[PDB]
Amino acid sequence: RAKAKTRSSRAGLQFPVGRVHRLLRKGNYSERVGAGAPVYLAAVLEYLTAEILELAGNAARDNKKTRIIPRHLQLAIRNDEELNKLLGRVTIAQGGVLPNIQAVLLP
Amino acid sequence: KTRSSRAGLQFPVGRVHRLLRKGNYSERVGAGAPVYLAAVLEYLTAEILELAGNAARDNKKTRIIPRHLQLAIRNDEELNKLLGRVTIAQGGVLPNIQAVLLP
Amino acid sequence: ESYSVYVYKVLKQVHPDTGISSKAMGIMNSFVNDIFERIAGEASRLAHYNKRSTITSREIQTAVRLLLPGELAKHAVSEGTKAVTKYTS
Amino acid sequence: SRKESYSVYVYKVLKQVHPDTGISSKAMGIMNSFVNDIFERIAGEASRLAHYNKRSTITSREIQTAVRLLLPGELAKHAVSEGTKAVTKYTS
Amino acid sequence: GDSESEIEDETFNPS
Amino acid sequence: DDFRDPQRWKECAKQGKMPCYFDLIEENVYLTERKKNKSHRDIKRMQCECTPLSKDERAQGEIACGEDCLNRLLMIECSSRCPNGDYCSNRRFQRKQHADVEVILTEKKGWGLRAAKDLPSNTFVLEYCGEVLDHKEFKARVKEYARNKNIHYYFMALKNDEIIDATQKGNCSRFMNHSCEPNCETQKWTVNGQLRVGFFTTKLVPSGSELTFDYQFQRYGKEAQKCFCGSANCRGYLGGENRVS
Amino acid sequence: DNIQGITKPAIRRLARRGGVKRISGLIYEETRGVLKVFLENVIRDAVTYTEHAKRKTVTAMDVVYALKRQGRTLYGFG
Amino acid sequence: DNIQGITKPAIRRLARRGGVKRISGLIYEETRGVLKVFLENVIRDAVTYTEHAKRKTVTAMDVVYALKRQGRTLYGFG
Amino acid sequence: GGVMKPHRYRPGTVALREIRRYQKSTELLIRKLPFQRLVREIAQDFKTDLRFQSSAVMALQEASEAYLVGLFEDTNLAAIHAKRVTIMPKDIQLARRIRGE
Amino acid sequence: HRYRPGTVALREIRRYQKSTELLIRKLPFQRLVREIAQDFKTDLRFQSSAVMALQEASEAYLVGLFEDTNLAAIHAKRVTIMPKDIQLARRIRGE
DNA sequence: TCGATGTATATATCTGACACGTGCCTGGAGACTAGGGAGTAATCCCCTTGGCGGTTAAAACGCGGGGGACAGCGCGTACGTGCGTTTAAGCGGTGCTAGAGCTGTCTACGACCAATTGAGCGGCC
DNA sequence: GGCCGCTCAATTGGTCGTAGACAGCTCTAGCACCGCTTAAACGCACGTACGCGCTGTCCCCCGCGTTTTAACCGCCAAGGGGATTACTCCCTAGTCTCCAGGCACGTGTCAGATATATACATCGA
């Protein structure tokens, strides 16, 4: 027969395509799912994941750490204005808040 | 006879059942789901219309207008909570003045 | 399509001596579609979280108790139960 | 029973954006919640767009519109480009 | 004097 | 009651025992109608939010639409649509509920008014009745009164387009004198979408006391009307030395 | 600059409906900015729905959907 | 009577994380009331989801779904 | 010869009347043409040569007026809370910030 | 040696904002959930992670409320928060 | 000018969470077809953009003046800070059995759909 | 004006398949409970920072007054664009077959938590 590589490889993505395709068909979002919807969606999800991890890794360096912890994700999200507006009503477990004191409280 | 008569309702059952299957809410729809939903929708409509009619009478008017629906929805503790994030066209607000503003 | 024809029937049953304008009717049309989508969407979530493929009267009842406030939910649930009872006999 | 996740994929992306940086199980759990949440929002919006236009198929075009409606500012521009680029490579 | 309102906002007619 | 008999009044007026005759009218009359603003429907819209008094509260004598009446606070009188209906105490002008007053001949200022009974503070006295004129009719009557050489003037500025003239027709309020230290004041009350002016006490006014208010008189005449209020704060002339158009 | 078209008394009138007894003189420029931003968000989404529908006209449903997405459902134009 | 179990220092520390420098002596009862209301709403929804699945134990997903519904969307519990 | 003038309305008392008048009524508070131009002008930054329905512009107006009404209602509470009556720009900024914008 | 009133407060703000722990004790909160839940369904049971999640949400919600409440206190040209400040914040948020 | 306590700091210790590894299911990939969704042409018509004249209301504008936004202050309560004492939250540990999660079988429920039928709109007489 | 038909969609009986409800069972997990540690919460004393009510002032926005302007009415016209019938041809769901990517469990190890004095930042007199 013929070999079989994964659609993620064909698309040049690291996030899965087959899994995204199954969730759309088995999640009752529509009667039919196009053959470009999962590829495009997987790429967008992967890009969003890379965009947040980039900021998370930088936050880890600022705190002189090697692993990413919930606090780093919280710092990364709340310090970037575009992600902030996207996740402005999301609570992250064990994440805390940003160091922030109003200018009238200290002499 | 129609299913609305069997349920003793006024709202349609066929249309509710049709929308559930056609609007992709699940793969299957049961038999009591549309009937129950239709009854709930009808009851909510009746509750709204009841308060609307009362608001119309207290304003000595015989036709429900958007302002009457607004008064009915906002002069109830729970309907306000259900429609707290909804705007009604030509509806206006409830007349109210804060107590430090009156002379 | 609209629900105007049905809204009239319900209106006369709570108030015989009244009418309704096209704008108010339009508002009621939006209200019915909104509450229908909220309940159906919530029932869809309930069915999906439980790995179910069928929306049933039970599903709607759970969605309704979640979506509507307390006292109102009690009246709504009573009407739903009564309707399904007459429908199944 | 075997259970669904995105941990391995988030790890693979992490290894690309930062070759020498780890991630804890709590953070990974957050990432799984984030991937599922964005997926549910985009798919839900695409479903809403398909239903409003009386269509039955959700295609890359609907996803593109949902993404443009859901992501704020320049983040949408980059996302849209990445999606188009991915679809192009998938077609060739 | 309220029939004037019908000119500004007409009654829905089911027929 | 002296004004209720036209024959006795007219003869007493010739004898100087009473002021000259005018048509006694119970309310302001518009000579020419004006473009009805969207505000005319206020007869309906100014629904107060007062609690309808119960049979018990009303039997006890409680004040329907009292000092806390949301319309009263805005100087608007209730219409027949008010929640308290005929029990509403905020329909003074419409129900002609004026105070008890007497017309007196003063030693040196001419005719004046005095309170007949003790009047509590913030209590309504009388409506300023007269004929409503526009700028052209107002100037025409000014040109006539100037031709007739009238000493007294009865023009009151109602609104931007409306002056009330009590020279030929009106009521007893037209005899209230000017004081720089007054005991009463005017208020632009709203009645059925129509504007009215009324006099109100600023303090308790005992019986027999002369009634006076600040005219803020727009002196247009060439000559100057002398002020006779006697108070140390006397402006010397109504409207002072400054002559306006 | 049609933003100047949202007149001084119109902003006053909206504040009056909101129950405001007295308004400062700096409220107008602020409200103009706020209104422009609000409309920009709603229009951007409505126009996006229009472009997706292959149309050129913005229907009322497009505005209702954009408003629903913003989280302010509007009843009457359905 | 467990609401008094939310001690004065706990409320103080939450306010401190929020950036509050000084707290009056009437805040504690109000905060207890607010927390009680918040928990009542979230728990009511979580319990309703629990009853639907025919289960006696409230899982973390049940609380997550309740928080998602009310617009909090807690991440970290699946 | 002079025209006496009655006492002017105490300031703000007319404002209260306007509050009642507008709160009672249900009508558009913004001029329709100026608003329609505003909708078109900003829309040109997103797509050139667009076209609008009349019901669509009405909807945008209802939402925009309702939004400002809601904003002012919440901001009024802030001005009152600061032991003030006049509304200031800082009050609107506070209201938007607490609301979450 | 004592600190001027306010200095330790500012120091506490820094350590708690810098830290990532929970501020309410676990057992008192754990009983509170069980009591409030009893009114909705008698004889319930909870997973450990489930109670934790309610705590995460409760503390995040209160912190969110206090940050916005603080803006109101500051806006009123005060520093001390008072119950009216919380009431204003909840009324503007829409509760 | 300079007391005194905390944070970040460097060093090593210590340990359980990470992360890399093997095993081997199950779900993704390739592949075929039949089917119908929607891409498209082709047409129609209806509201939309556009024109103007014309009215009169609202908006713009300019004013006096008096309400309130505001700064500064004196008072005194009340909250922060620090202590010594009290206690229960926390941990590690015990053991029980409720009930969560699962697999399996079978019953009935709903999709499908052909056929059967009336509702509501409409034209023809 | 009222009666016969159409177009649409609502309802029925049946076949068909497979989703779900019952029933059994396993073992994860939550629960109740014990005893000690040791951090936290509590009650009080104290004095300072602050919330507050009063006060005098300025300036700001109001109500009022008059003019300027273009927003509504309305009617009429051109045609851009939206809504809607047929064709077809492409894409996607579905059912089968096969195999390797991804997940659960299993060592081993190394980054952060613990432990301490060092040395520096910050706040009090």
Residue numbers in the entry:
A (entry chain c): 12 to 118
B (entry chain g): 16 to 118
C (entry chain h): 35 to 123
D (entry chain d): 32 to 123
E (entry chain j): 937 to 951
F (entry chain O): 1452 to 1696
G (entry chain b), H (entry chain f): 24 to 101
I (entry chain a): 34 to 134
Give the article text.
The deposition of H3K36me3 occurs co-transcriptionally when the methyltransferase SETD2 associates with RNA polymerase II. The deposition of H3K36me3 is carried out by the conserved histone methyltransferase SETD251. Here we present three cryo-EM structures of SETD2 bound to RNA polymerase II elongation complexes at different states of nucleosome passage.
Focused 3D classification of the upstream region resulted in a 4.8 Å reconstruction of the catalytic SET domain (residues 1452–1696) bound to the nucleosome that we refer to as State 2. Compared to the upstream hexasome observed in State 1, in State 2 the catalytic SET domain now binds to the proximal H3 tail at SHL − 1. Although this region of SPT16 is known to bind free H2A–H2B dimers, we observe this interaction in the context of a complete nucleosome. Applying a Gaussian filter to the nucleosome reconstruction allowed further tracing of the DNA, providing an estimate of Pol II direction, and confirming SETD2 is bound to the proximal H3 histone (relative to Pol II). Surprisingly, adjacent to the catalytic SET domain, above SHL − 1, we identified globular density in our cryo-EM map. There are only 20 unstructured amino acids between the last modeled residue of the SET domain and the beginning of the helical AID, therefore we assumed this density corresponds to the AID. Deposition of the final H2A–H2B dimer allows FACT dissociation from the nucleosome dyad and allows the SET domain to methylate the proximal H3 tail.
